[PDB]
Amino acid sequence: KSSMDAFRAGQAERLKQLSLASSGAMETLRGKLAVAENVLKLAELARKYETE
Amino acid sequence: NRLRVEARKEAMLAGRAGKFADVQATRIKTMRQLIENRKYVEKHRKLHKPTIVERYANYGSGTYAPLQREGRFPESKPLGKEIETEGYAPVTLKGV
Amino acid sequence: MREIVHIQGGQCGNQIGAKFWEVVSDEHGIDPTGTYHGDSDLQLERINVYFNEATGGRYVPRAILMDLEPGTMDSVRSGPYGQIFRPDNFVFGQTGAGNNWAKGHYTEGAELIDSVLDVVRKEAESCDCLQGFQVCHSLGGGTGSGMGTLLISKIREEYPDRMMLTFSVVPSPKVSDTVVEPYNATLSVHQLVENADECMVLDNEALYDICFRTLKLTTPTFGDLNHLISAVMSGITCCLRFPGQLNADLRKLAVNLIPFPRLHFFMVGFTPLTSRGSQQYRALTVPELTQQMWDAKNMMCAADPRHGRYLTASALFRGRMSTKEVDEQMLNVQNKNSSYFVEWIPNNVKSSVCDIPPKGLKMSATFIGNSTAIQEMFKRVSEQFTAMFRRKAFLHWYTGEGMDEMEFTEAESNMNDLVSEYQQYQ
Amino acid sequence: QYDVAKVSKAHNDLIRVYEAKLTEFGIPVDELGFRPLVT
Ligand SMILES: Nc1nc2c(ncn2[C@@H]2O[C@H](COP(=O)(O)OP(=O)(O)O)[C@@H](O)[C@H]2O)c(=O)[nH]1
Known part of the structure; x- marks a missing residue:
């Protein structure tokens, strides 16, 4: 039973750390993408008043 | 009679291949x-x-070809509020 | 079979919907206690479009109230016919909308719209073969536009195969209620033109001009305005409840009206609207119901069609009439006013006839036009928007709740290109 | 202006070759969606 608990705890901890680090990375990447899409939208709106 | 039968058969099969142009x-x-x-x-x-x-x-390499069916035409102004700034630009060194 | 769920967003939408439900209950012949006390069976043949048999005749409407205060909810309960709605559908927060688009689309929306979706989904799955959605709201407030518009967007994403009728009380310049009406209207139409399928646009300016000229009322309180908007929303969809000589489903109306997927704002009126005094003298046959129908002063919108062109019109008649008479009416109207009509659409008018007139009246009609002169309201609201957006007035109440300038510019550009799309065809 | 004529004629020629390519398979019909502008 001690072996049981040790192994299961190890698996739980590794899942915890993977999920947390991955979530942080995705949040950073999504922030970058949001900045980029705001830039593209501003470019799209601005080029409306440009002459041919 | 053999030639007549074959002529009839070939003419009818051509008339039906005309229909098979509409099945392919x-x-x-x-599909x-x-x-x-x-x-x-x-x-x-x-x-x-x-x-x-x-x-x-997606479209081209940074473009967009709007289909005429949607009816979203932002690239062409209604010609009422049209913009043309070429005339205002100076043509002489005095203007410059 | 076919049915429509209804939602009443904000105070204006809630009161309009309450009057609408009173009108529908009167037409179908049911008591405020919920029991049926009508006269004929043609009405109870098709009540399942708006009502559900609860237990032994206690019919319950298929609508959901929605606001952020309990005062309006208490008012609608205390009012007549307010004792029929399901108490499980009186969803409402407590904090207060603050007439703020951010406060009704980003905080209280995020704190109550999961629940409002839960209840509306329960109703939409209780009903078997859906046909569409019906929503009532105003485009000049915070929870009228925020709450209702976010609900529209979520419902469109969740059931993207159901025709959607949103009835929008657009702000009118002379009846200026609050200070941020242009901001809210812009931020609401930005999402309506993108998600919702058709909005019937109404305005208090024309709703008052009608009452002063045609009705000849002395002191029209909001009761009469809500009565007119009701009588319009009741006749917008009658081919479902009652049989007709030439039926017309909501999807049929949409496909006949909307030529392009972004020109779906409908300007609507009702006939006959006869004053209490002159009605006893007036004559009511088809070739004057149609004349008042196309009368520019009967339109529930401060945009005279003589300032633009008609893309499509829809005339829904009610009562036993002559179809050939109706068709010759429409044809001669088009030939008389060819100039006001678009060239590349033959027979711009779609006509429908239903066999059951409303309560008391023997003939009735409803007009729904897609004229390109409706660009005037959007142009005016955009002008009022840009009058304030140059100086960022009243903008920190949205900036602090978390909206940038990018979406404001997006919404204004959306309005501008919509105006361009109307103007180009004309 | 001779260069302009060259590029315009080549534009028309590529419209021709592309419509030929589409019709040869026939998997789309001759035309779909948008309509190209002609100089
Ligand atoms: N037709 C009609 N309009 C109303 C009624 N009550 C209020 N209104 C309009 O609704 C507007 C108020 O907007 P409101 O609903 O408070 O915005 P919200 O708080 O975001 O929902 C005002 O400009 C009024 O003209 C009514 O009983 N009938």
């Missing part, structure tokens, strides 16, 4: 419409909405 297309059209409707089982018309980056990257 109905095969390819149905093409079926390969695409298979991808709309998840989101039939919401998937048609792309992100701005995807939309810009």
Whole structure:
């Protein structure tokens, strides 16, 4: 039973750390993408008043 | 009689190959419409909405060819509030 | 079979919907206690479009109230016919909308709209073969536009195969209620033109001009305005409840009206609207119901069609009439006013006839036009928007709740290109 | 202006070759969606 608990705890901890680090990375990447899409939208709106 | 029978058969088969010109297309059209409707089982018309980056990257290499069916015509002003600044630019060193 | 769920967003939408439900209950012949006390069976043949048999005749409406205060909810309960709605559908927060688009689309929306979707989804799955959605709201407030518009967007994403009728009380310049009406209207139409399928646009300016000229009322309180908007929303969809000589489903109306997927704002009126005094003298046959129908002063919108062109019109008649008479009416109207009509659409008018007139009246009609002169309201609201957006007035109440300038510019550009799309065809 | 004529004629020629390519398979019909502008 001690072996049981040790192994299961190890698996739980590794899942915890993977999920947390991955979530942080995705949040950073999504922030970058949001900045980029705001830039593209501003470019799209601005080029409306440009002459041919 | 043999020649007459064969002439009748060939003329009728040509007249029916005229009809088969209208079955081959109905095969390819149905195939093409079926390969695409298979991808709309998840989101039939919401998937048609792309992100701005995807939309810009898809058509050409940073362009967009709007189909005349949607009726969204922002690239062409109604000619009422048209813009042309070429005339205002100076042509002489005095203006410069 | 076919049915419509209804949602009443904000105070204006709630009161309009309450009057609408009173009108529908009167037409179908049911008591405020919920029991049926009508006269004929043609009405109870098709009540399942708006009502559900609860227990032994206690019919319950298929509508959901929605606001952020309990005062309006208490008012509608205390008012007549307010004792029929399901108490499980009186969803409402407590904090207060603050007439703020951010406060009704980003905080209280995020704190109550999961629940409002839960209840509306329960109703939409209780009903078997859906036909569409019906929503009532105003485009000049915070929870009228925020709450209702976010609900519209979520419902469109969740059931993207159901025709959607949103009835929008657009702000009118002379009746200026609050200070941020242009901001809210811009931020609301930005999402309506993108998600919702058709909005019937109404305005208090024309709703008062009608009452002063045609009705000849002395002191029209909001009761009469809500009565007119009701009588319009009741006749917008009658081919479902009652049989007709030439039926017209909601989807049929949409496909006949909307030529392009972005020109779906409908300007609407009702006939006959006869004053209490002159009605006893007035004559009511088809070739004057149609004349008042196309009368520019009967339109519930401060945009005279003589300032633009008609893309499509829809005339829904009610009562036993002559179809050939109706068709010759429409044809001669088009030939008389060819100039006001678009060239590349033959027979711009779609006509429908239903066999059951409303309560008391023997003939009735409803007009729904897609004229390109409706660009005037959007142009005016955009002008009022840009009058304030140059100086960022009243903008920190949205900036602090978390909206940038990018979406404001997006919404204004959306309005501008919509105006361009109307103007180009004309 | 001779260069302009060259590029315009080549534009028309590529419209021709592309419509020929589409019709040869026939998997789309001759025309779909948008309509190209002609100089
Ligand atoms: N037709 C009608 N309009 C109303 C009534 N009560 C209020 N209104 C309009 O609704 C507007 C108020 O907007 P409101 O609903 O408070 O915005 P919200 O708080 O975001 O929902 C005012 O400009 C009024 O003209 C009514 O009983 N009938």
